[PDB]
Design a binder for this molecule. Structure first.
Ligand SMILES: CCCc1cc(=O)n2nc(NCc3ccc(-c4ccccc4)cc3F)nc2[nH]1
Ligand SMILES: [Zn+2]
Length: 346
């Protein structure tokens, strides 16, 4: 059918929409941090990645877990690709001079002061800070009991996208070549991240993702007739929720640890490329459309191939990233869900 899936999406929608003081608590903390960082020599160009009043919830089942990004513009950037990894880069070349080690911008130093400044502002305020191996997210704050906020520091570059993206973002037959060109004129972001430990940064395009999801049809009027939607966004929510529920179901074992929403999002956008017509996403076909997505993700697990949507030579499912045993384990869980009308969805 398609009836149970609607009930799941309705539950998720009402949980997200219900009245809550959490966004206001998060806002007060964030505004406090931004004011403090702006009067520091290294962070005076810092600001929120998106200045909307609705915060980012990466975990679709967790309305008390917030994700925020602080962006810092860096003029005249020089990038050097690290170890042929396509997605990881040294930063070379002003205010960030204090973090150089040679010609190379040190992420770990920059995070240390970012953390320290945030640490000394938290005490000035019911907020607590936790350091855990990371840096993207750089800092996790906890507000009262339930509310948590991940803060990521990102560099912004307004120069052309790196060569590794030249053949990515293959939306030309879905969103048009005109739109691909406008999107590629937008800035790109870099977040501190190791590939496996050097001073490397990873390309981040979460603003492009958000723009496409809000203007996602082949037809420009897609989903504007509010009673005859497409089901693209619902399919992506369902895929996100499937992985989150399986990860929770098996938090005691380790096999699903390396999977994240990047993997589900990526597979979904490949199915959007595969199926560019809005008629392939009719809301009546929610169940069949979700099954296309599930089926494609399962093909990717079995072939151990999932190309990054922006950098096609980066294989998210390579065996050095996620080993065979872990991919084979997620395959069997998903095919049990698929064959039993998704028990995690009730
Ligand atoms: C719209 C499709 C989804 C999407 C959103 C977004 O914001 N971005 N941002 C990049 N940047 C490039 C990039 C990012 C992460 C990883 C990665 C991830 C896990 C493990 C290892 C490596 C590999 C990469 F090549 N890719 C994406 N895809
Ligand atoms: Zn639509």
């Amino acid at each position: 059918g398609a009836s149970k899936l609607r009930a799941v999406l309705e539950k998720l929608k009402l949980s997200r929409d219900d009245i809550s003081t959490a966004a206001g608590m998060v806002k007060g903390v964030v505004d406090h941090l931004l004011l403090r960082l702006k009067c520091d020599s290294a962070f005076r160009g810092v600001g929120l990645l998106n200045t909307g009043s609705y915060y980012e919830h990466v975990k679709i089942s967790a309305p008390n877990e917030f994700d925020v990004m602080f962006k810092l513009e860096v003029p005249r950037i020089q990038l050097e690709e690290y170890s042929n990894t396509r997605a990881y880069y040294f930063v070379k070349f002003n205010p960030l001079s204090q973090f150089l080690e040679g010609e190379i911008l040190s992420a770990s130093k920059m995070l240390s002061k970012f953390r320290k400044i945030i640490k000394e502002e938290i005490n000035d305020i019911d907020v607590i800070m936790k350091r855990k191996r990371g840096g993207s997210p750089a800092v996790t704050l906890l507000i009262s009991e339930k509310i948590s906020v991940d803060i990521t520091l990102a560099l912004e570059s307004k120069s052309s996208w790196p060569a590794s993206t030249q053949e990515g973002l293959r939306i030309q037959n879905w969103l048009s070549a005109k739109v691909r060109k406008q999107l590629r004129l937008k800035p790109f972001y870099l977040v501190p991240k190791h590939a496996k430990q050097e001073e490397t940064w990873r390309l981040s395009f979460s603003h492009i993702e958000k723009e496409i999801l809000n203007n996602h049809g082949k037809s420009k009027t897609c989903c504007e007739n509010k009673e005859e939607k497409c089901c693209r966004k619902d399919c992506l929510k369902l895929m996100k929720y499937l992985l989150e529920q399986l990860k929770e179901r098996f938090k005691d074992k380790k096999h699903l640890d390396k999977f994240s929403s990047y993997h589900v999002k990526t597979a979904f956008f490949h199915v959007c490329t595969q199926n560019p017509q809005d008629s392939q996403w009719d809301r009546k076909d929610l169940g069949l459309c979700f099954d296309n997505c599930v089926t494609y993700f399962l093909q990717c697990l079995r072939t151990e191939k999932l190309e990054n949507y922006f950098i096609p030579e980066f294989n998210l499912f390579s065996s050095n990233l996620i080993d065979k045993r872990s991919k084979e384990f997620l395959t069997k869980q998903i095919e049990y869900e698929r064959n039993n009308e998704f028990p995690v969805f009730d």
